[PDB]
Write a protein that binds this ligand. Sequence first.
Ligand SMILES: *C(=O)[C@H](C[C@@H]1CCNC1=O)NC(=O)[C@H](CC1CCCCC1)NC(=O)c1cc2ccccc2[nH]1
Length: 162
Amino acid sequence: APPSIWSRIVNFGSGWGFWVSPSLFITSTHVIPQSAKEFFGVPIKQIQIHKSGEFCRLRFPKPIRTDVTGMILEEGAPEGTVATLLIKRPTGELMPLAARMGTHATMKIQGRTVGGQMGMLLLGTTPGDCGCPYIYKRGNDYVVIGVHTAAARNTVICATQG
Ligand SMILES: *C(=O)[C@H](C[C@@H]1CCNC1=O)NC(=O)[C@H](CC1CCCCC1)NC(=O)c1cc2ccccc2[nH]1
């Protein structure tokens, strides 16, 4: 992925989030800092925050990332698609991970209702990785399909919009 794509991934609370477009930031719900007063310098009351299970959209009142184009956001990928989980680490290291996406489902994880799509990793994910995006290339378009929310020892769970 080009630097433009990686630059959309930004640390956010205990994990990460992803700029889909100049005004739209997505992340995993459980990652969002509680009792934060502002995100990216914007008071929280001015942000439109919509949670769909563990998929969270934050829509800012003015464009924040005017440098980025709006990317296609879809609810998961067709079954069998090998997506890339774009992991950033706090050291700065980039760790793209290939994951074959499987069935869509809604299930409880540690008592929380999670709608998303499970994948299988093809050197793994760690507790600080949630909120990183799943993307794949469809023709000449990059498509973002969800955010990293959970993993087991090679199942990964991509939370998707409802
Ligand atoms: C991000 O916060 C982490 C990333 C995981 C940690 C371990 N490897 C990863 O990729 N996410 C979690 O730890 C989730 C937290 C849940 C909180 C409530 C909302 C849904 C996510 N939990 C797990 O990843 C998890 C729970 C669990 C239980 C039993 C077996 C495996 C297992 N994995």
